[PDB]
Amino acid sequence: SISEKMVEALNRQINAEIYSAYLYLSMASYFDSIGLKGFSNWMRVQWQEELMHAMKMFDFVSERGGRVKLYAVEEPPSEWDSPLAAFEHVYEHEVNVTKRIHELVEMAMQEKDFATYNFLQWYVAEQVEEEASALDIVEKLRLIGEDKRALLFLDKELSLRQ
Amino acid sequence: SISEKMVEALNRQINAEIYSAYLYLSMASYFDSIGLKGFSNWMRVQWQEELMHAMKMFDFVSERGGRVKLYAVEEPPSEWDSPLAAFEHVYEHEVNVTKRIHELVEMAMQEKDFATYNFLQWYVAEQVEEEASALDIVEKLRLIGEDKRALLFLDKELSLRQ
Amino acid sequence: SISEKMVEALNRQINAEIYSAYLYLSMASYFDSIGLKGFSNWMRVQWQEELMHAMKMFDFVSERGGRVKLYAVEEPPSEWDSPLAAFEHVYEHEVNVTKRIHELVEMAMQEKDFATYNFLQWYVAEQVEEEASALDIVEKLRLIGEDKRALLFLDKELSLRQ
Amino acid sequence: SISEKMVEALNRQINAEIYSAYLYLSMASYFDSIGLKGFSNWMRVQWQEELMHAMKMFDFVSERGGRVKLYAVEEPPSEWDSPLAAFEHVYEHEVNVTKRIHELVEMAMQEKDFATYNFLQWYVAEQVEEEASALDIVEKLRLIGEDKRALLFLDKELSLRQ
Amino acid sequence: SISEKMVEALNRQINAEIYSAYLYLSMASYFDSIGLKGFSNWMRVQWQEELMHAMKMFDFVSERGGRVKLYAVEEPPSEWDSPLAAFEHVYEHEVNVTKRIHELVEMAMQEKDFATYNFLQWYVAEQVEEEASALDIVEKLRLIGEDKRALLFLDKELSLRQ
Amino acid sequence: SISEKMVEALNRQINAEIYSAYLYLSMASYFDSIGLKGFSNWMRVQWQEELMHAMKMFDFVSERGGRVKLYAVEEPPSEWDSPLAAFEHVYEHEVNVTKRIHELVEMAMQEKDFATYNFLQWYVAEQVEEEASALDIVEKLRLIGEDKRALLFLDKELSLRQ
Ligand SMILES: [Zn+2]
Ligand SMILES: [Zn+2]
Ligand SMILES: [Zn+2]
Ligand SMILES: [Zn+2]
Ligand SMILES: [Zn+2]
Ligand SMILES: [Zn+2]
Ligand SMILES: [Zn+2]
Ligand SMILES: [Zn+2]
Ligand SMILES: [Zn+2]
Ligand SMILES: [Zn+2]
Ligand SMILES: [Zn+2]
Ligand SMILES: [Zn+2]
Numbered sequence: 019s020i021s022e023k024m025v026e027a028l029n030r031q032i033n034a035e036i037y038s039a040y041l042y043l044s045m046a047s048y049f050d051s052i053g054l055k056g057f058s059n060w061m062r063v064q065w066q067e068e069l070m071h072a073m074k075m076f077d078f079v080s081e082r083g084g085r086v087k088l089y090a091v092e093e094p095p096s097e098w099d100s101p102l103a104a105f106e107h108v109y110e111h112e113v114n115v116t117k118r119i120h121e122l123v124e125m126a127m128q129e130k131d132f133a134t135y136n137f138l139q140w141y142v143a144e145q146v147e148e149e150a151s152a153l154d155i156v157e158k159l160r161l162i163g164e165d166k167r168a169l170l171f172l173d174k175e176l177s178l179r180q
Numbered sequence: 181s182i183s184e185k186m187v188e189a190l191n192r193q194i195n196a197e198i199y200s201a202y203l204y205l206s207m208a209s210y211f212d213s214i215g216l217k218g219f220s221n222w223m224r225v226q227w228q229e230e231l232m233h234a235m236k237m238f239d240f241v242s243e244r245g246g247r248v249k250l251y252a253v254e255e256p257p258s259e260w261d262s263p264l265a266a267f268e269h270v271y272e273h274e275v276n277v278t279k280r281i282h283e284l285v286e287m288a289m290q291e292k293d294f295a296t297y298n299f300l301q302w303y304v305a306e307q308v309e310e311e312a313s314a315l316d317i318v319e320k321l322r323l324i325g326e327d328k329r330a331l332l333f334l335d336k337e338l339s340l341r342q
Numbered sequence: 343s344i345s346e347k348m349v350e351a352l353n354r355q356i357n358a359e360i361y362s363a364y365l366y367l368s369m370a371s372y373f374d375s376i377g378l379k380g381f382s383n384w385m386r387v388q389w390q391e392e393l394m395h396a397m398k399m400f401d402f403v404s405e406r407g408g409r410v411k412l413y414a415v416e417e418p419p420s421e422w423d424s425p426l427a428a429f430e431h432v433y434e435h436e437v438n439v440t441k442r443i444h445e446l447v448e449m450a451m452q453e454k455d456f457a458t459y460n461f462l463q464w465y466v467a468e469q470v471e472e473e474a475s476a477l478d479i480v481e482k483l484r485l486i487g488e489d490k491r492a493l494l495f496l497d498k499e500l501s502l503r504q
Numbered sequence: 505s506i507s508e509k510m511v512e513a514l515n516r517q518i519n520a521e522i523y524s525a526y527l528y529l530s531m532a533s534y535f536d537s538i539g540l541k542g543f544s545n546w547m548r549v550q551w552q553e554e555l556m557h558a559m560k561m562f563d564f565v566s567e568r569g570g571r572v573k574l575y576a577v578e579e580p581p582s583e584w585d586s587p588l589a590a591f592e593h594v595y596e597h598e599v600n601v602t603k604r605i606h607e608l609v610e611m612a613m614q615e616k617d618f619a620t621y622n623f624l625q626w627y628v629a630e631q632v633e634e635e636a637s638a639l640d641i642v643e644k645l646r647l648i649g650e651d652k653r654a655l656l657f658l659d660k661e662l663s664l665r666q
Numbered sequence: 667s668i669s670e671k672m673v674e675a676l677n678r679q680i681n682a683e684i685y686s687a688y689l690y691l692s693m694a695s696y697f698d699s700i701g702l703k704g705f706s707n708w709m710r711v712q713w714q715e716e717l718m719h720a721m722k723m724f725d726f727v728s729e730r731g732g733r734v735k736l737y738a739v740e741e742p743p744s745e746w747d748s749p750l751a752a753f754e755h756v757y758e759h760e761v762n763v764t765k766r767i768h769e770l771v772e773m774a775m776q777e778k779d780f781a782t783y784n785f786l787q788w789y790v791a792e793q794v795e796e797e798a799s800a801l802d803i804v805e806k807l808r809l810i811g812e813d814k815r816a817l818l819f820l821d822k823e824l825s826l827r828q
Numbered sequence: 829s830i831s832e833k834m835v836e837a838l839n840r841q842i843n844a845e846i847y848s849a850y851l852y853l854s855m856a857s858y859f860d861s862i863g864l865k866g867f868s869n870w871m872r873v874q875w876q877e878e879l880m881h882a883m884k885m886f887d888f889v890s891e892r893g894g895r896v897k898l899y900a901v902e903e904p905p906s907e908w909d910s911p912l913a914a915f916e917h918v919y920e921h922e923v924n925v926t927k928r929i930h931e932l933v934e935m936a937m938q939e940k941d942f943a944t945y946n947f948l949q950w951y952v953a954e955q956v957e958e959e960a961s962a963l964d965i966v967e968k969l970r971l972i973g974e975d976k977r978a979l980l981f982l983d984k985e986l987s988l989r990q
Contacts, residue, residue, distance in 0.1 A: 040250060040253070043238075043250060044250050047238075047242070047247065047248045047249075047250070050242050051242075051247055052647075053640065053643045053644055053647060055640075069231075076205075076209075080209065080212045085209065085213055086209040086212075087209070087258060088202060088205060088206050088209070088255065088256055088258065089255055090252055090253065090254055090255045091202070091252060091253035092252055093250065093251055093252040094250055096249060096250070166647065166648055166649070166651045166653075166654040167651060167653040167654040167657050170648075170654055170657050170658070171657065174661075243632060243633075243636045244632065244636075245635070245636070245639065275343070278343075282454065282456050285456055286454075292606070292610075294606055294609055294628050295628060295629070295631070295632050298625050298628045298629050299629070299632075301460050304456045304457060304459075304460045305457075305460050305461075307457070308405060308406060308457050308461075309405075311407075312405050312406075312407070315407065437505075440505075440619075444616070444618050447618055448616075463622050466618050466619060466622045467619075467622055467623070469619070470567060470568065470619050470623075471567075473569070474567045474568075474569070477569065478701065478703075481701040482701055482818075485700075485701060485814065486814055486818075487814070489814045489815060491814075491815040492814040492815040492818060494815075495815050495818050495819065496818070499822070526736060526739075529724075529736060530736050533724075533728070533733065533734040533735070533736070536728045536734075537733055537829075538940065538942075539940065539941065539942035539943050540942065555717075562691075562695075566695065566698045566699075571695065571699055572695045573695075573744060574688065574691060574692050574695070574741065574742055574744065575741055576738060576739060576740055576741040577688070577738060577739035578738055579736065579737055579738040580736055582735055582736065652937055652940070656942060656945070656946070659942075667893050730893075731829060731892075731893045
C-alpha cells in the first residue's frame with residue numbers, strides 16, 4: 019500500500035528503463051553509421067519496447083496512488099568497437115537491469131507490498147527473455163567472426179523483428 | 181552535402197523534441213496527481229507525438245548522410261499552479277519550439293541546403309497545429325475560470341484524444 | 343505572431359476567392375441564357391471550387407490566431423460577347439488571381455512568416471491547374487471558331503465536369 | 505509567364521532524366537553480362553523510375569504553357585570494372601543530378617517563378633532518397649569487398665526490388 | 667548459339683524501337699501544343715508500347731546469351747503540318763519498321779537461328795496491327811478534312827486508349 | 829558464356845548422376861533377391877530421383893547454351909554382403925557425390941559463373957538430405973543387427989517411400 023521508498027525506487031527504475039531505451043537508440047545510430055540497417059531496426063524496436071516497460075511502470079506507480087517524478091536522462095555512449103561489442107554491452111546492461119528488478123522484488127516483499135511484487139513478476143519474466151535474446155545474438159556474432167555473408171544474413175534476420 | 185553545423189543544429193532539435201515529449205510526460209504525472217485523467221491522457225498522446233517528431237528528424241539526419249548524436253534529456257519541471265498554468269506553459273513552449281524550427285529554416289536557406297529546407301516545411305506546418313491546439317485549450321480554460329464542473333467537462337473531452 | 347497586415351491581406355484574398363466564385367456563377371447564368379448548359383455546369387462546378395478555395399483560407403486565418411473579416415462581394419458583370427470572350431476573361435481573371443497569390447507569398451517571405459508561406463504553396467500549385475484548365479478551353483474555342491456544331495460538342499464535354 | 509530560359513532548362517533536365525534512365529539500362533545489361541540478375545533487376549526498376557521522373561517534368565512544362573523539345577539521348581558507357589565501381593558511378597551521377605535540380609531551384613527563385621519553384625521541391629526531396637539509396641549500396645559493396653558469397657547475398661536482396 | 671551478327675542486328679532494332687518510342691513522344695508534345703489531348707494520349711500510350719517492344723527484345727538478346735549494347739537515340743522531328751501529316755508519318759515509319767523486321771527474320775533463318783526466327787514472329791504479327799491502326803486513323807483524318815467537330819470526335823475516341 | 833570447361837564438368841556430373849541411379853537400380857535387384865521389397869522400393873524411388881537430378885542438370889546445361897554429351901554408364905556392382913553393407917555403400921557414394929558437387933561449386937565461383945553457382949545450390953542442399961537419409965538408415969541397421977523382426981519393420985517403413 020504504496021510506500022514513499024517503493025515509489026522512489028520505482029521512479030528510479032522508470033528512469034533506468036528510459037535510459038535503456040535511449041542507450042539502444044544510440045546503438046541504432048551506431049549500426050546505421052556502419053550500414054547494418056537490420057541491426058538498427060532491432061535497436062529501434064528495443065527502444066520502443068523499453069519505453070513501453072517504463073510506461074507500464076509509470077502507470078502502475080500512478081494507479082497505486084504514488085507520484086511519478088521524472089529525472090534527467092543521461093547522455094549515452096555513442097560508439098562501439100563492432101557489432102559483437104555492442105551486443106555484449108546489451109547483454110551486460112540487461113543482466114544489470116535484472117539485478118535491479120530483483121532488488122525491487124525483494125524490497126516489495128520486505129514491505130509486504132504484494133501488488134508491487136505481483137506487478138514486478140512481469141519484469142522478472144521479461145528479463146529472462148531479454149538476456150536470452152541478447153546472449154543468443156552475442157553467440158551468433160562470435161561464430162560469425164569476420165564472415166561478411168554471415169554478418170549480412172544475421173542483419174537480415176534482425177530486420178524482421180517487429 | 182549537409183554541413184557539420186546543420187547536423188549539430190538538427191541534433192539539438194532532436195534533443196528539444198525529446199525534451200518536449202518529456203515535459204509533457206511530466207505534465208501527465210501532474211494531471212494524474214490532481215485527478216484530471218483526461219488532461220493526463222492528452223499529455224500522454226502529446227508525449228508519443230513529440231517522440232514521433234523526434235524520430236522523423238533522427239531518420240532524416242542519417243538519410244542525409246549525417247550522424248545523430250544524442251544528448252542528455254534535462255529534468256523537466258514537475259508542478260504547475262493550475263491546469264491553465266500548465267497549458268499556458270504548453271503554448272509558450274510550443275511558440276519557442278516554432279522559433280527554433282524557423283531558425284533551422286533560416287540556417288538551411290543561408291547554406292542553400294534545399295534538402296533540409298524542404299524537409300523542415302513539415303515542421304513549419306506542424307507547429308501551426310501545435311500552437312492552435314494548445315491555445316484553444318488555454319482559451320477554454322480562461323472561459324472556464326474557476327468553474328470546476330466545466331473543468332471536468334473539458335477533462336472528459338480531452339480523454340477522447342487518441 | 344501572424345501580423346495584422348498579413349491577416350488583412352489574407353482576408354482580402356478570401357474576398358477575392360468568393361468574388362471569383364460569384365463571377366463564375368454569373369457566367370453560369372450567361373451560359374444558360376444562350377442555351378449552353380454544359381458551359382453552365384462547368385461554371386457551377388467552378389463556383390463550388392472557388393468557395394472551397396475561400397473556406398480553406400478562412401480556416402487558416404483563425405488557425406493562425408487571426409480573425410477573418412468579411413467584406414462586401416461586388417456585383418459581377420453579366421454579359422460576354424461570346425463563349426470565347428467569357429473564357430478569355432476566366433483565364434485573365436485566374437492569371438490575376440495568381441499574381442495576387444504570388445504577392446501574398448512575397449509578403450510572407452518578407453515577414454519571415456514561414457507558416458503562411460508554406461500554407462500558400464497549395465495555392466501556388468492550384469493556380470497552375472486553374473490557368474491551364476481555362477487556357478485549354480480558350481484554345482479549343484479559338485480552334486472551333488464560329489462552327490456551332492463543334493461548340494455544342496464542347497458544351498457536351500463540359501457537362502461531364504463533376 | 506514561364507520564361508523561355510526556364511522552359512529550356514527544364515527541357516534539358518527532361519533530357520538528363522531520360523539519360524539517367526538510359527545509363528541505368530546500360531548498367532542492367534552489364535549486370536546481366538556478369539550474372540548478377542538482382543543488380544540487373546535493381547537497374548531495370550531504376551530505369552523505369554527515371555523515366556517517370558522525366559515524364560513528370562514533361563507534363564509540367566506543357567501544363568505551365570511551355571513546349572517540350574526533345575534532344576538526342578547520348579550513348580551511355582557500357583562497362584564498369586566491378587559492381588562497386590558501377591554503384592559509385594550511380595552515386596556520383598545522382599549527386600550531379602542533385603546539383604542540376606538545385607540550379608533549377610535557384611533559377612526559379614531568381615525569376616520569381618514560384619510555380620516552377622514549388623514543383624521542383626518534389627525533385628529536391630526525391631534526390632535525398634536517390635543519393636541515400638545509392639550510397640547505402642556503395643557502402644555495402646565496400647564492406648563486402650572481394651567476398652563473392654556476400655556479393656551474391658546482396659544480389660538476391662536487390663532482386664526483391666519492385 | 668546466338669551469333670554476334672544476330673546480336674548486333676537485334677541491338678540496332680532495340681535502338682530503332684526506342685527511337686520509335688521517342689518519335690511518338692515528340693508527336694505527343696506536338697498534339698499537346700495544338701490542344702488535342704486525346705491524340706496526345708494515343709501517342710503517350712504508343713511511346714509506352716514501343717518501349718515495351720524494345721524491352722522484350724532486350725530481354726531476349728540477354729536470355730539467348732547475347733550482350734545488349736545501347737546506342738545514342740537521335741533527336742526526333744518536333745513539328746508536323748497537321749494531325750493528318752503526323753499520322754501519315756506514323757504510318758510510313760511503321761511500314762519501314764515492318765520491312766526491317768522481315769529482314770531480321772530472313773537473317774535468322776539464313777543463320778538457322780530458329781529461336782530468333784520464332785521470337786521475331788511476335789513482331790511480324792504486331793507490325794500487322796501497328797500498320798493497320800495507323801492507316802485506320804490516317805483514313806479517318808483524311809475524311810475529316812477541316813471539319814472541327816469531327817476532329818474533336820476522333821480526339822475523344824483516341825483519349826480512351828490505354 | 830558458360831565455359832567449355834564448366835560444360836564438360838557438368839556433363840561428367842550428369843554421367844555420375846545417371847550412374848548413381850543405375851547403382852541404386854542394381855541394389856533394387858539385390859534387395860529383391862533377398863526378399864526385402866520395402867528396401868527394393870526405396871531403391872527404385874532413389875533410382876527415379878537420381879534420374880531427375882540428372883535431367884535437371886541436362887536441362888540447365890542446355891538452357892545455358894551448352895551442349896550435353898552423354899558418356900557410357902558403367903556396369904555397377906550387383907552383390908552386397910548385407911542390407912547394412914548396401915546402405916554403407918549408399919552413404920559413402922553420396923559423400924563422394926557431395927565432394928564432386930562442392931568441386932563444381934568452387935569451379936563455378938572461380939569462373940564467376942554465378943548462374944551455375946546458384947543452380948548448384950539445389951544440389952548442395954539435396955546432398956545434405958541424401959547423406960542424412962542414408963546415414964539414418966545405416967544407423968538403424970546397426971541397431972537392428974540380426975534381429976529379424978526389426979529388419980522386417982524397417983523394410984515395411986521403407987515400403988512407404990514415394
Ligand atoms: Zn526494460
Ligand atoms: Zn530490457
Ligand atoms: Zn514537436
Ligand atoms: Zn510540439
Ligand atoms: Zn481560387
Ligand atoms: Zn481559381
Ligand atoms: Zn531522376
Ligand atoms: Zn535519379
Ligand atoms: Zn514497335
Ligand atoms: Zn510500332
Ligand atoms: Zn543425385
Ligand atoms: Zn543422390
